[PDB]
Structures are given as C-alpha cells and as structure tokens.
Amino acid sequence: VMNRLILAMDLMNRDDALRVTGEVREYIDTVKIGYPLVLSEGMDIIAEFRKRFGCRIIADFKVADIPETNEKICRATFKAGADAIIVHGFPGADSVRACLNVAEEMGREVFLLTEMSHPGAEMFIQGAADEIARMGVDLGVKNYVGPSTRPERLSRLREIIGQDSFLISPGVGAQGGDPGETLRFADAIIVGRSIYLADNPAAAAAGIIESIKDL
Amino acid sequence: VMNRLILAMDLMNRDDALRVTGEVREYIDTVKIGYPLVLSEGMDIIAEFRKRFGCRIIADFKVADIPETNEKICRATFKAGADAIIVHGFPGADSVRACLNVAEEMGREVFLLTEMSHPGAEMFIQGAADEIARMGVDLGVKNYVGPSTRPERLSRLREIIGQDSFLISPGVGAQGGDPGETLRFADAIIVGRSIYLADNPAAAAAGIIESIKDL
Ligand SMILES: N#Cc1cc(=O)[nH]c(=O)n1[C@@H]1O[C@H](COP(=O)(O)O)[C@@H](O)[C@H]1O
Ligand SMILES: N#Cc1cc(=O)[nH]c(=O)n1[C@@H]1O[C@H](COP(=O)(O)O)[C@@H](O)[C@H]1O
C-alpha cells in the first residue's frame, strides 16, 4: 500500500468523508471503510470511493457470524466493489472458510483479524489470538490484522504467519500506537482519527509518512 | 415476543423479504434483521419493516469492534429505528459498555451474544462463553443470545444469567435445534431458513407455533 499507510475512514457523513479522503489521497493507496460510514451512507459509498479516488477499498466489517450468514455478507460486500473484507477469527474455522470460499469465487481477498487493539481485547481475544493466527495459516489465509498497541503481540503474530504474509495494524495515534515501532512487524499501518479529526488531515498524513520514510 | 418466535429475515431481496415477512406476520411480534438484508437493501429497510409490519426489530449486527467504533455503529443503528442490537461479548467489557452507553442514551436495548450455534463456536467461543455471560451480568446486561444447537450450554447460560434475564436462541430447524427443547431454557427461539426457504412460510411458522403451544 502506498507509503504503508491505510486511512480508516470512519466519518459518518458522505461530504466530510469525501473531503478528507480527497485531501489525503496523494499520501495513501488504500482506504478502510467500515460500518460507521456504510450504515450512515449506504453500500454504494464503496464504489463511489473506488471510482473517485482510484484507491483500493478494504471493507472492515469484522465478519463474525455463522458460515451461512458470513457467505451472504461477503457476497454483498464484494458485489458492492470492495477489494477485501476483514473477518474475525474467533468464530472459528468454518466461519472463516465461508468467507474464503466467497473471496475465491469473486477474485477478492480476506484479512483475518487475530488480536484487537483496545483494552478489552485482553479479556478473551488475546488468549486465543496465537491459535487464531495458526488457524489462519492452516486455512491458507495470507492477510492478517494485529494490534499496534501491543508490538510484542504483533511480533509474535508475525512469527506465526511468516514473512510472506501481509499484516496491517490499527491502533496508531489515537489509541497510543507508534508508526515506526508498528512497522517493525506490520507491512502497513491503519490510521483513522489522528488523520480524519486533524485540523489539517493532509498535514497529519504527511507527518506520518515523513516519520515512515525515515525508518 | 408473540408466540416466542422471532423470524430471522436473511433474504437479500426487499421484495422477497417483504413477501415472506407479511405472510408470517400473524405468528410473530419481532423480526431479526441482519447484514444480509441491510447490506443488500440499505438501512432504510429497518424503518420500512417497522412501519409496514408494526413489529419490533432486532438488528443482528454482531457488533464486534473497539469501543469508539461500536458506539458509532450503535448510534447509526438506533437512528435507523432498530429496537435492539445484538453485540458480541468476545471482544470484552469496554466494547460491550460502549454499546450499553448508546442504548441508554437512545432508550433502546442491547442483546449480548455469548456462545454461538455453529460448529466453529467450539474452537474459541465456547471456552469463553460462561465468562462472557458473567461479564454481561456484571455490566447489567438483561438480554442474551445463546445456542439452540447445544441445550446443555443453553442451560448453563440460563443458570448464569438468572430467570429474570431474557434469552433468545438461534439454530432451530436448519442447524439442527429443536423448538421445544430450546424453549426449556430460552424465552424465545429465532428461526430463519426453516420458515423463509419453506414452500409455504406461513405453514412452516404455524407448525412451529403449534409445537410451541403444546409445551
Ligand atoms: N481493522 C480494524 C480494527 C481492529 C482493531 O483491533 N482495532 C481497530 O481500531 N480497528 C479499526 O481500525 C480503526 C482505528 O481507527 P483510529 O486510528 O483508532 O481512529 C477503526 O476503524 C477501528 O474500528
Ligand atoms: N442472532 C444470531 C446468530 C447467532 C448464532 O449463534 N447463530 C445464528 O445462527 N445466528 C443468526 O440466527 C439466524 C439463524 O438462521 P437459521 O434459522 O439457521 O436460518 C441467522 O440470522 C444467523 O446469522
């Protein structure tokens, strides 16, 4: 991804989301669109973004249902033009496999979310995360998400998935993660509020890239 | 809920979803709408159903993000007219509390999904599920979801949440669960495909209710 930086576009207004995305487009090559924007403006926003910005779109839908429902969610999401979808690993291998089957059918990608970045992830997810990552490897998952807020965990996740797998990492900025340290282990960082709530989102993005280029 | 039966409306077409829901409306009082329908037809389908059918709507969005994103998802969902939202407990107490805070602000309800009904739930969720339920009790959650496919687990979950808590249960019919056995422990059952894929959905719903009445 361009400059190893993915914008988490979680504004909930089409005009504000378009404005900020257009302002930082020279500094990114992929935008993560989640439910805050989609549930407020509709699934058509994915193809609008893909067209107007020529960016790749990751649908951060944290898919976490039974296999039959996961298949439907993935089909709707790729039909809407998303390049990839983020899927939770904790519902188990059959739920992940359902998403992989639809991605194979539609020529798209699945990212497996292993450990999450927020404090509550320590309660249940962290204890299962190594095993979720190993499950991913066994299923042939090549794209993973793990937490900027815990670089020791990001290191362990990288160890499990190997160097060939692609690893992206949220929790940079607002949640306390650091771009440089996270990029020791992740291929790309995801950044939302530090950019989209900034007085000058382009200046915020540029500042991040300057720190990245230095690594 | 009327007749202790909630329709899981996971058809992806507005016309088919409206047809089936209309045909079975005399036998239910609540419709569970999830991402298959919403991502295909838009969030406005929630208010359409509420208006047309005068039914309560549970948004089955399996909310499973960090606290800040959860609050955004819950706000959009209640703005759209949902009566309640289903939230995963696996991501931890702060993520659940974020949803409870928005439900409190907006005068709506949260259902906490503890153990899931599909085979993959055995890998990670089942081992955490008693603790997820206890966490719900500690947070003051009053509405829970647990699996028709494992009535011994449903019994244990009922034990933890007490008799005053409201418990709904999917996995009836297509996934193998039984209405009568599940209603030993749950207050209401959720049924999707056994009704919506039936040649005569009204006849399928009526058959289920006849079996419920006998208990
Ligand atoms: N993908 C993802 C995901 C997994 C995770 O463990 N932690 C996150 O913050 N996220 C998402 O990344 C973004 C982080 O944004 P921010 O930079 O904290 O504002 C949000 O969209 C959040 O929902
Ligand atoms: N709520 C919920 C949920 C939790 C769970 O553990 N198992 C489920 O099947 N569900 C949902 O209930 C419905 C079950 O539908 P069906 O009766 O198997 O066709 C689907 O919407 C599924 O996504």
UniProtKB/Swiss-Prot annotation, chains A, B:
Enzyme class: lyase
CDD domains: OMP_decarboxylase_like
The EC number(s) this enzyme carries: 4.1.1.23
BP GO annotations: 'de novo' pyrimidine nucleobase biosynthetic process; 'de novo' UMP biosynthetic process
Pfam family, one: OMPdecase
Residues where substrate binds: 10, 32, 60-69, 117, 170-180, 192-193
InterPro entries: Aldolase_TIM (IPR013785), OMPdecase (IPR014732), OMPdecase_arc (IPR047595), OMPdecase_AS (IPR018089), OMPdeCOase_dom (IPR001754), RibuloseP-bd_barrel (IPR011060)
Active site location: 62 (proton donor)
GO molecular function: orotidine-5'-phosphate decarboxylase activity
Annotated pathway: Pyrimidine metabolism; UMP biosynthesis via de novo pathway; UMP from orotate: step 2/2
Keyword Protein transport: no
One cellular-component annotation, GO: cytosol
Sorted UniProt keywords: Decarboxylase, Lyase, Pyrimidine biosynthesis
Recorded catalytic activity of this chain's protein: orotidine 5'-phosphate + H(+) = UMP + CO2
Task performed by this protein: Catalyzes the decarboxylation of orotidine 5'-monophosphate (OMP) to uridine 5'-monophosphate (UMP).
Record's subunit section: Homodimer.
PANTHER family the UniProt entry points to: OROTIDINE 5'-PHOSPHATE DECARBOXYLASE
Family: Belongs to the OMP decarboxylase family. Type 1 subfamily.
Name the UniProt record assigns to this protein: Orotidine 5'-phosphate decarboxylase
Organism of this sequence: Methanothermobacter thermautotrophicus (strain ATCC 29096 / DSM 1053 / JCM 10044 / NBRC 100330 / Delta H) (Methanobacterium thermoautotrophicum)
Classification lineage: Archaea, Methanobacteriati, Methanobacteriota, Methanomada group, Methanobacteria
